[PDB]
Amino acid sequence: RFLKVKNWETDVVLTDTLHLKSTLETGCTEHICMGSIMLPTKDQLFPLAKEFLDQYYSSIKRFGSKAHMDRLEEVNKEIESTSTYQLKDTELIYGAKHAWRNASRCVGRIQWSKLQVFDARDCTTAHGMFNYICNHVKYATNKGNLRSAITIFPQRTDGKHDFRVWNSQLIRYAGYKQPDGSTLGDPANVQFTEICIQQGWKAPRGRFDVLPLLLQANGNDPELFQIPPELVLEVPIRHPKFDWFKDLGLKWYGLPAVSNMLLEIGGLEFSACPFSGWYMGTEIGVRDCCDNSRYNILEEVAKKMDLDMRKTSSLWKDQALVEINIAVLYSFQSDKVTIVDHHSATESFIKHMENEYRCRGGCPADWVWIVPPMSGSITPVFHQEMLNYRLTPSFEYQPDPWNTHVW
Amino acid sequence: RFLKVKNWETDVVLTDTLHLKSTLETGCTEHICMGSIMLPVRTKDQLFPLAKEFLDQYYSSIKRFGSKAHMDRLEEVNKEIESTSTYQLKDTELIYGAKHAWRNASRCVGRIQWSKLQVFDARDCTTAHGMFNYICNHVKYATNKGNLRSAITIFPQRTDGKHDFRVWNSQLIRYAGYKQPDGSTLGDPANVQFTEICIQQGWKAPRGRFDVLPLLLQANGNDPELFQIPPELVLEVPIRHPKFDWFKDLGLKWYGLPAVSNMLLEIGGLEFSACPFSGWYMGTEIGVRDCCDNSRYNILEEVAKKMDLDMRKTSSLWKDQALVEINIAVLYSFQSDKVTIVDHHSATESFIKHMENEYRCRGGCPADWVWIVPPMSGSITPVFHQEMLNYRLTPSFEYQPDPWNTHVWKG
Ligand code: HEM
Ligand code: HEM
Ligand SMILES: Cc1cc(N)nc(COC[C@@H](CN)OCc2cc(C)cc(N)n2)c1
Ligand SMILES: Cc1cc(N)nc(COC[C@@H](CN)OCc2cc(C)cc(N)n2)c1
Ligand SMILES: C[C@H](O)[C@H](O)[C@H]1CNc2nc(N)[nH]c(=O)c2N1
Ligand SMILES: C[C@H](O)[C@H](O)[C@H]1CNc2nc(N)[nH]c(=O)c2N1
Ligand SMILES: [Zn+2]
């Protein structure tokens, strides 16, 4: 029942008890591990509310207090009367921070308690959503000195009046199928681009076109808005040694901002809750630049470096990969846009895991996501056993809305 | 039931049905995943079902399921078990069994090769000297002057658990490690405890950086005995770099033959506690782990220094740069000396083709993503993008306790 995790590099063993709280299911059974799979009423609501409020009142050292019992009763009466309830500001903020704290796939959680929470529960229209999001973008970007933020739109009611940001991130680049047969821009974003075009967006048909926002308020049909260009901070990619690197014409945007997830707090569902931090360099240099189905630039870089590409065993892919990742970190640092390298980030996560074990009795972590997509075993998380389990408040995946929306 | 796995780079979806044949437990539950945990005497009554399921699988594989030969063999095994408490595998069943344990090894990226395995039957072995001779022959056969051949040697199965055959070494060939009084280590820090055991048992340690350990062998539950592998049978490759002429002066070399000797082979409920097996290396096993783990030879700094990398900040990626160069050096050296090695790109590409073939012809391929993905350049290998299902099929290779923890010393 009490489980140990071992670090195989340092021999340090930690005991996990926090997993006994876990509520949701993992996808695994005693017969089969699904660790590597990417996506595996009034009655229901009150126990979920109670469980959360219990944890909240515990955190402020007022468990079993008058104010604790009074709030529980107040929420009970509210659910019985209205079929739902409203979180106090203090609760919303706690909940948001804890959803991050509980995010098993996030290496950056040492930062979890420094999150700026923007309460957009008063928003009613898509134009309002656009204004809140521009403000989030400008606040988080902070002229390159990035600050973690989440903006929280109104909670789900009957599920026919959902707030959704249709975009997967606040800032991403368009992708277009060419008559040529090749793909211009980001191949990951072809379907969503078509939805935008189909809804009226005038597409520039370039390599690095920032997508408009497609915003849905109160379950109405979504609307297009372009983020003010001057609020989207971008970084041209160059290399400290290779003068030719800039001629590849590569750039990336500074703000990673996930907008397609659902925040669950105390049984309430926040279907539009864009959140942002700052990049770990491999997210851009390994994944965005080098994935076969993304910008896929390994060959072009290898050629400019004049590597022997006739045989895999020359490790030309590996050499080019490192150089691309060097250039990403150098360009962000030179322009003073916050970024963290995978060595620094994983070292921080190990310190954070130790804090969480010491202070909370554990830290749910998904090793498959936490270990960086390059140089895995030269980072300390590679040698760290991790236990993966689901705690609430949480960020959850949810269906893409175009599959779900009735026009 | 059907389970689907998707490849996120190609959108190829595969359907697994083989998982329905899984028996043994994973460690995970519907509430916790233990997929990154490294390590998550049999009654008559339990043995006959295990024998039967294995024999059913064997007979199916030879398209003789339900035949007179199959039925007679079940009966013969049933009678042997009730009369002697155990049974003996036919040579054919043993070969099938060993090949399948490899086929079933979910942490092994090299399984495209599973059907090409030379099985040395050592069940007539009775003494440690006899084990030493079997193992020298395995090493010479497998080495094949650099043209490496996969092989396994199988010593007598467990009886009462008081007469076990064991190879105490974790691999047939490994380098000694010595903790110095000042807390530094000479040689391979992973092998310090075992080196101390070897010295206690009487080994005269050369005390250098690459001393091949002696074999420590236990026959029939007796105290283990020390033997030196003839040096002329131990193929080693000096590590040099194609462009950096200073690389050779780091004084590195590695052995050509990776041979796991500490695992237990389970076939039809029988337990072969001494079953050393060998193939050939994937380059990252040496260049990433053996050379660069902080707990192993740990050479990254010295390499980075010699390359004149900016070592003032991790964000120059000096570690990553030096890591690639070391791994180029390992592949270059093995190739230059005509010692079989495979790079991580080739190996993973071959694994994906193997896995797709298994899904189509066998209904699945249990695989442990945490182990299959190489420890460098993960996402530029096709396995990183492949969803996998991990479950346990028998026959199998299993971990077992280190024998110094369990052995009853005779004196
Ligand atoms: C401040 C710096 C941060 C860093 C360096 C960071 C790091 C990362 C990285 C590298 C990933 C994997 C991304 C991928 O491979 O696609 C990730 C995932 C994730 N992070 Fe963070 N994170 C940060 C901030 C945040 C914040 C502010 C939140 C929420 C408030 C958050 C929540 C999440 C979630 C829910 C995932 C999983 C996303 C998914 O499943 O697609 N992170 N994090
Ligand atoms: C023929 C070339 C082979 C290659 C390239 C290869 C590759 C590998 C690699 C890279 C690993 C992970 C090693 C580690 O990180 O410690 C491994 C694990 C393993 N392989 Fe293979 N393999 C080969 C042959 C074999 C053979 C012949 C067998 C047995 C008949 C086998 C059974 C296993 C087992 C049981 C593991 C898991 C070991 C453990 O848990 O420590 N492999 N393989
Ligand atoms: C908040 C945050 C900070 C940070 N450094 N990184 C992130 C993650 O970035 C967004 C991620 C969410 N999975 O999206 C990238 C992506 C793209 C594609 C095509 C698939 C996928 N799963 N993920 C989020
Ligand atoms: C047969 C075979 C072929 C091949 N290419 N590689 C292997 C595996 O190599 C041996 C491995 C077994 N995991 O041993 C390395 C090791 C060392 C230490 C200190 C711990 C550990 N778990 N593993 C085995
Ligand atoms: C199949 C596998 O789960 C998938 O490719 C994963 C692996 N690990 C990952 N790790 C991170 N951080 N991000 C990812 O998108 C993925 N993708
Ligand atoms: C804790 C973690 O499971 C451990 O460090 C693993 C990860 N993946 C691995 N993969 C391989 N091939 N070999 C290993 O030793 C490990 N070690
Ligand atoms: Zn699992």
> Which residues are within 8 A (CB) of B369 and not within 5 positions of it... i.e. 6 or more apart?
A35, A36, A368, B35, B383, B386, B387, B388, B390
DSSP state of A310: S
- Token duo for residue B348: 């993973």
Ligand minimally distant from the alpha carbon of residue A103 = 1
Alpha helices, H only, A34-156: 42-59, 66-82, 89-101, 126-141
- Token duo for residue A149: 């933020």
Determine the residue among A14, A25, A315, A366 to mutate to test chain B binding: the one whose Cβ has the most chain B Cβ atoms within 10 Å. Answer: A315
Q: What's the resolution in A?
A: 1.9
B151 ligand 2 Cβ < 6 A:
no
Q: At what angle do helices A66-82 and A42-59 cross, to 10 degrees?
A: 160
Beta bridge partner(s), residue B265: B272, B397
Any idea which residue has 């996402």 for tokens?
Answer: B379
- A133 shares contact with chain B (CB less than 8 Å): no
Q: Do B377 and A321 touch (CB under 8 A)?
A: yes
Gap between the Cα atoms of B86 and A43, Å rounded: 57
8 A C-beta contact, residue B155 and residue B275: yes
| End-to-end Cα spacing for chain A | 50
Nearest to A9 among B294, B314, B389 (CB): B294
3-state secondary structure of A72: helix
Query: What is the three-state SS of A77-91?
Result: HHHHHHCCCCCCHHH
- Ligand 3 centroid–CA A101 distance in Å is 17
Amino acid code (one letter) for B177? G
Nearest-CA distance from B291 to chain A in Å?
11
- Token duo for residue A206: 């370039």
Nearest to A373 among B379, B386, B389 (CB): B379
Gap between the Cα atoms of A156 and A162, Å rounded: 6
- Ligand 1 centroid–CA A292 distance in Å is 22
DSSP secondary structure letters along A164-199 = EE-SSBSS-B-EEE-TTSSEEE-GGGHHHHHHHHHT
Gap between the Cα atoms of A397 and A406, Å rounded: 20
Gap between the Cα atoms of B328 and A315, Å rounded: 6
Q: What share of residues in chain A are helix, strand, coil (percent, to 5)? A: 40, 15, 45
- A286 shares contact with chain B (CB less than 8 Å): yes
8 A C-beta contact, residue A44 and residue A51: no
Determine the residue among A8, A295, A318, A385 to mutate to test chain B binding: the one whose Cβ has the most chain B Cβ atoms within 10 Å. Answer: A318
Gap between the Cα atoms of A214 and A175, Å rounded: 16
Q: Which of B242, B238, B241 is nearest to B252 (CA)?
A: B238
Q: Distance from CA of residue B145 to its chain's centroid?
A: 21
Gap between the Cα atoms of A336 and A146, Å rounded: 10
Task: Tell me which H or E stretch contains A282.
Answer: helix A281-282
Q: Do B370 and A374 touch (CB under 8 A)?
A: no
Gap between the Cα atoms of A88 and A63, Å rounded: 17
Q: Map out the domains of chain B with their CATH numbers.
A: 16-123+150-160+264-278+348-372 (3.90.340.10), 124-149+164-235+399-403 (3.90.440.10), 236-258+281-346 (3.90.1230.10)
Gap between the Cα atoms of A102 and A249, Å rounded: 38
B342 ligand 2 Cβ < 6 A:
yes
- Token duo for residue A201: 């967006």
- B192 shares contact with chain A (CB less than 8 Å): no
Nearest to B323 among A286, A293, A375 (CB): A375
> At residue A11, what are phi and psi to the nearest 5 degrees?
65, 0
Would the annotation count B280 as a binding residue?
A: yes
Nearest to A322 among B35, B38, B320 (CB): B320
A109 in active site: yes
Q: Which long-range contacts (CB under 8 A, 24 or more apart) does B114-118 make?
A: B116/B150, B117/B150, B117/B151, B117/B152, B117/B277, B118/B142, B118/B149, B118/B150, B118/B151, B118/B152
Gap between the Cα atoms of B341 and B347, Å rounded: 10
- Token duo for residue B132: 């030493």
- Ligand 2 centroid–CA B348 distance in Å is 13
Q: Do A318 and B378 touch (CB under 8 A)?
A: no
List C-alpha distances in Å: A122 to A125, A286, B115, B379: 10, 40, 66, 42
> At residue A143, what are phi and psi to the nearest 5 degrees?
50, 35
- Ligand 7 centroid–CA A113 distance in Å is 29
- B301 shares contact with chain A (CB less than 8 Å): no
Q: Do A385 and B5 touch (CB under 8 A)?
A: no
8 A C-beta contact, residue B386 and residue B359: no
Gap between the Cα atoms of A345 and B376, Å rounded: 17
Pairing label, strands A116-119, A149-152 = parallel
> At residue B5, what are phi and psi to the nearest 5 degrees?
-125, 140
Cβ neighbours of A31 in B, within 8 Å: 19, 22, 25-26, 391
Any idea which residue has 């991403």 for tokens?
Answer: A172
- B21 shares contact with chain A (CB less than 8 Å): no
Cβ neighbours of B343 in A, within 8 Å: 312-313, 315
8 A C-beta contact, residue B98 and residue B154: yes
Ligand 3 binding pocket mutation candidate from A168, A273, A292 (most atoms within 8 A of CB): A168
Q: Distance from CA of residue B312 to its chain's centroid?
A: 38
Q: Which residues of chain B from 95 to 114 reach within 8 Å of chain A, CB to CB?
A: none
A62 in active site: no
Q: Largest Cα–Cα distance in chain B? A: 74
Q: Do B317 and A32 touch (CB under 8 A)?
A: no
DSSP state of A146: -
Ligand 4 binding pocket mutation candidate from B38, B171, B402 (most atoms within 8 A of CB): B171
Positions of B annotated as catalytic residues are 108, 111, 280, 285
Query: What is the three-state SS of chain B?
Result: CCEEEEECCCCCEEEECHHHHCCCCCCCCCCCECCCCCCCCCCHHHHHHHHHHHHHHHHHHCCCCCCHHHHHHHHHHHHHHHHHCCCCCCHHHHHHHHHHHHHCCCCCCCHHHCCCCEEEECCCCCCHHHHHHHHHHHHHHHHHHHCCCCEEEECCCCCCCCCCCEECCCECCCECEEECCCCCEEECHHHHHHHHHHHHCCCCCCCCCCCECCEEEECCCCCCEEECCCHHHCCEEECCCCCCCCHHHHCCEEECCCEECCCEEEECCEEECCCCEECCEEHHHHHHHHHHCCCCCCCHHHHHHHCCCCCCCHHHCHHHHHHHHHHHHHHHHHHHCCCCEECHHHHHHHHHHHHHHHHHHHCCCCCCHHHHCCCCCHHHCHHHHECCCECCCCCEEECCCCHHHHCCCCC
Numbered residues of the known binding site of A for L-arginine: 169, 278-279, 283
Q: Which residues of chain B from 373 to 402 reach within 8 Å of chain A, CB to CB?
A: 373-380, 384-391
| End-to-end Cα spacing for chain B | 55
- Ligand 2 centroid–CA B400 distance in Å is 16
Pairing label, strands B259-260, B277-278 = antiparallel
Any idea which residue has 């660790």 for tokens?
Answer: A35
3-state secondary structure of A253: strand
- Token duo for residue A395: 């960020």
> Which residues are within 8 A (CB) of B181 and not within 5 positions of it... i.e. 6 or more apart?
none
Of all protein residues, the one whose alpha carbon is nearest to atom 16 of ligand 1 is A283
Cβ neighbours of A8 in B, within 8 Å: 38, 295
* Residues whose beta carbon lies within 6 Å of some atom of ligand 3: A 108, 169, 188, 256, 258, 275-280, 283
- A172 shares contact with chain B (CB less than 8 Å): no
Nearest-CA distance from A118 to chain B in Å?
32
Q: Distance from CA of residue B254 to its chain's centroid?
A: 17
Of all protein residues, the one whose alpha carbon is nearest to atom 19 of ligand 3 is A188
Of all protein residues, the one whose alpha carbon is nearest to atom 4 of ligand 2 is B110
- Token duo for residue A72: 């529980």
Ligand minimally distant from the alpha carbon of residue A13 = 6
Cβ neighbours of B26 in A, within 8 Å: 28-33
Gap between the Cα atoms of B282 and B277, Å rounded: 15
Of all protein residues, the one whose alpha carbon is nearest to atom 17 of ligand 2 is B108
